[PDB]
Scaffold this active site. Structure first.
Site, mmCIF file in Angstrom:
data_model
loop_
_atom_site.group_PDB
_atom_site.id
_atom_site.type_symbol
_atom_site.label_atom_id
_atom_site.label_comp_id
_atom_site.label_asym_id
_atom_site.label_seq_id
_atom_site.Cartn_x
_atom_site.Cartn_y
_atom_site.Cartn_z
ATOM 1 N N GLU A 35 0.812 -1.203 0.000
ATOM 2 C CA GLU A 35 0.000 0.000 0.000
ATOM 3 C C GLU A 35 0.847 1.254 0.000
ATOM 4 O OE1 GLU A 35 -2.927 0.204 -0.769
ATOM 5 O OE2 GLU A 35 -3.842 -1.746 -0.352
ATOM 6 N N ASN A 46 -7.552 8.849 -5.975
ATOM 7 C CA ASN A 46 -8.374 7.858 -6.700
ATOM 8 C C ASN A 46 -9.109 8.649 -7.773
ATOM 9 O OD1 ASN A 46 -7.596 5.809 -4.983
ATOM 10 N ND2 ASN A 46 -9.056 6.558 -3.448
ATOM 11 N N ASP A 48 -12.097 8.674 -8.597
ATOM 12 C CA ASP A 48 -13.362 9.198 -8.168
ATOM 13 C C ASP A 48 -13.287 10.435 -7.325
ATOM 14 O OD1 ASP A 48 -12.612 8.255 -5.643
ATOM 15 O OD2 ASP A 48 -14.231 6.988 -5.355
ATOM 16 N N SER A 50 -11.816 10.646 -4.293
ATOM 17 C CA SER A 50 -11.386 10.275 -2.932
ATOM 18 C C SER A 50 -9.805 10.177 -2.935
ATOM 19 C CB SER A 50 -12.054 8.997 -2.520
ATOM 20 O OG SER A 50 -11.562 7.892 -3.340
ATOM 21 N N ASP A 52 -6.521 8.089 -0.693
ATOM 22 C CA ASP A 52 -6.048 7.056 0.244
ATOM 23 C C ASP A 52 -4.881 7.633 1.033
ATOM 24 O OD1 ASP A 52 -7.857 5.312 -0.962
ATOM 25 O OD2 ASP A 52 -6.247 4.233 -1.979
ATOM 26 N N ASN A 59 -9.088 4.963 2.743
ATOM 27 C CA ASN A 59 -9.837 5.788 1.816
ATOM 28 C C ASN A 59 -10.825 6.729 2.418
ATOM 29 O OD1 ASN A 59 -11.192 6.702 -0.504
ATOM 30 N ND2 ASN A 59 -11.384 4.640 -1.471
ATOM 31 N N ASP A 101 -15.517 -5.054 8.479
ATOM 32 C CA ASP A 101 -16.708 -4.536 7.766
ATOM 33 C C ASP A 101 -17.444 -5.584 6.931
ATOM 34 O OD1 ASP A 101 -15.519 -4.751 5.153
ATOM 35 O OD2 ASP A 101 -15.232 -2.582 4.903
#
Ligand SMILES: N#C[C][C][S]([C]C(=O)[N]C(=O)O[C][C][C][C][C][C][N][C]1[C](C#N)N([O])C2=C([C]=[C][C]=[C]2)N1[O])B1234B567B89%10B%11%12%13B85%14B%1158B%12%11%15B%139%12B%1061B%12%112B5%153B%14874
Ligand SMILES: N#C[C][C][S]([C]C(=O)[N]C(=O)O[C][C][C][C][C][C][N][C]1[C](C#N)N([O])C2=C([C]=[C][C]=[C]2)N1[O])B1234B567B89%10B%11%12%13B85%14B%1158B%12%11%15B%139%12B%1061B%12%112B5%153B%14874
Ligand code: NA
Ligand code: NA
Length: 129
Positions: A35, A46, A48, A50, A52, A59, A101
């Site tokens: 990562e 990202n 979109d 967003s 990280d 995120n 999650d």
């Protein structure tokens, strides 16, 4: 901060990530490697809009607030900047929520693609832990 491998393993253990949700420490060290290359300051945008953040590239779409991801959640109840600190506490606490999650460590695409089903114990091999 750029952690060493065993240094990060040790930090993860102290903050209770080892075996958390059944994921052995090598899984977490491998995820952090791919990562962030063990760099707590790592940020990546990202497609979109967003972002990280940090050692485990958490995120802004779901987990932290950065003020510039419309429609997003902040399920870890933290500013995303907190996830860039030298001290990994905030990143570990948030990662515990993420891994709980439903998807386990598949939430980290780099874990699924580069750590899942490999010798993850290699990442902690040799370490005094
Ligand atoms: S884990 C096993 C695992 O996560 N397997 C799973 O992901 O398989 C599905 C994907 C296929 C992986 C096939 C290749 N696996 C190799 C290997 C190679 N190539 N190796 O060279 C190994 C090895 C395990 C241990 C030493 C060398 N290993 O599992 B495993 B290892 B240790 B004792 B050993 B055995 B049991 B315990 B832990 B449990 B099992 B292995
Ligand atoms: N999953 C699974 C099957 C494991 S079998 C191997 C097995 O049962 N070995 C195991 O009982 O060894 C006992 C020593 C465990 C030492 C574990 C630490 N080292 C690891 C490791 C772990 N943990 N891994 O998960 C590895 C690995 C090396 C390469 C891949 C995965 N490795 O060195 B094996 B046989 B066939 B083809 B043959 B080779 B590969 B595939 B299967 B895989 B490997 B053998
Ligand atoms: Na456990
Ligand atoms: Na957010």
């Amino acid at each position: 901060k750029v952690f060493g491998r065993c240094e990060l393993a040790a930090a993860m253990k102290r903050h209770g990530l080892d075996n958390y949700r059944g994921y052995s420490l090598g899984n977490w060290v491998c995820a952090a490697k791919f990562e962030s290359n063990f760099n707590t300051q790592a940020t990546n945008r990202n497609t979109d809009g967003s972002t990280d953040y940090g050692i485990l590239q958490i995120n802004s779409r779901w987990w932290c607030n950065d003020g510039r991801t419309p429609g997003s959640r902040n399920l870890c109840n933290i500013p995303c900047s907190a996830l860039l600190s030298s001290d990994i506490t905030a990143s570990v606490n948030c990662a515990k929520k993420i891994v709980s999650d439903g998807n386990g460590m598949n939430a980290w695409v780099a874990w699924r693609n580069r750590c899942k089903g490999t010798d993850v114990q290699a990442w902690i091999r040799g370490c005094r832990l």
